[PDB]
Amino acid sequence: KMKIGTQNQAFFPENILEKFRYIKEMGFDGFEIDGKLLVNNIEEVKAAIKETGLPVTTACGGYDGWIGDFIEERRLNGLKQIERILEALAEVGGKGIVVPAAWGMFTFRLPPMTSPRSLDGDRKMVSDSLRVLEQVAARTGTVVYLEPLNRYQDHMINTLADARRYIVENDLKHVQIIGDFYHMNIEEDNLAQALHDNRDLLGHVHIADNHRYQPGSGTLDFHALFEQLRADNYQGYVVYEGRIRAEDPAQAYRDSLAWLRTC
Template sequence: MEGDEIKLATQDRGFFGSTYEQKLSKLKELGFEGLEIDGKSLIENYSEIEKAVKATGVPISSICGGYRGWIGDFDNERRKLAIADIGEIMKRTAEIGAAGVIAPAAFGIFSRKLPPFAPPRPAGVEREALLDSLCKLNDHALSTGSALLLEPLNRYEDHMINKLGDAASLIQEGGFREVKVMADFFHMQIEERDISASLRETGDLVAHVHLADSHLQPGFGHTDFRKGFRTLKEIGFEGHMAIWRWRTI
């Protein structure tokens, strides 16, 4: 995947400008083809964002965060909040033309690699909770024309979904048409034995990619992006790849 075939986006950063038209204009000048923002910003600034997209021709590529709770939250009420908030964000996501809303199972609530090592609920109950959340969000996605982008995180940040295959297994078990996989090179270089093999196995379920190296910004670590890009091209990936870790010093 080389040259003009790459659709490169980036997450929002303050140094791109203070208004969305400034941000998107700056990104266009730098050669980016999309901006990833959080859901709260999308809802609160929708009119401004819509005008900026029309004025610059640079789309909002995806939505990351900006909602309460987690879809795999231990607290059932917070899990319901996540489902409700993401459902509301999806309405705007579809209207703005973004690929979907990114969601891990959870972030930072538990790791099997850190004490106390055993999560507070059985694995079967956790899977049931995730399948229930994904079922409801798949329904939201179908009704809004959006998608949920399920993101595996590394073993230190989450204990439920760590590999692309974990995400794909849930999607396939539930038969969820509008739940896709978000592949993040930072997490993949920790969790996947062979990134290219995992991408091939996940195939067309991969709908969005995050570009981050083993040490922050791409190019500052040891990740083999060229091999990964070639594999993405092989499986027919046509979505955005968003830089989400910027080295500012």
């Protein structure tokens, strides 16, 4: 039995309590919340968790400035915002925040082809951000989940092994890996083997099918990967992150979850 959560989707109710109710009745085990929605509505979120029993598992997004941002002022402002998100997560019982090195800032694979910063420059800035967030995570009892993205979305961290290097070489104790099936389907040599080899640091999982749409609408072998997580005694959640391609979005979402329950 896997614990299966979801991020927000546009067809979810806007009202926080109704949103939690709606997510619960679809069958999900948890909610991965936007960081700014969480910080700006802490008490509403706490109430909704209490009334529904649907927990906030994690936060994702909600800050302006990547931990590996090219612009130093933006990186530092982002760290201040991520600190607030971690504080809010502790107040509602969330486990941690999902962050990539960056999104949509640069890629080696599309023009402009030349990075404005050296590889050592990338590593120093990401490492410094993670060292700072390690201090906040220790204070708040939370974790930073470091997410490799595919090569088009980020140049710095593309594989689980990339994230592992940052964690191990900085000897971080409050930064874990989050593997995303969609990005892994592009970047990993062997998805199940990557989950296994990193079971010591894999703290969170994102799921979507190979084309980023609802699980089951593509051909990712969710049953095989779930079996790998079971064999490794995976403790965390698997959380929907991605898009919906369907005439009836809500029905396709429910059907995907029902199908995942048989994996």
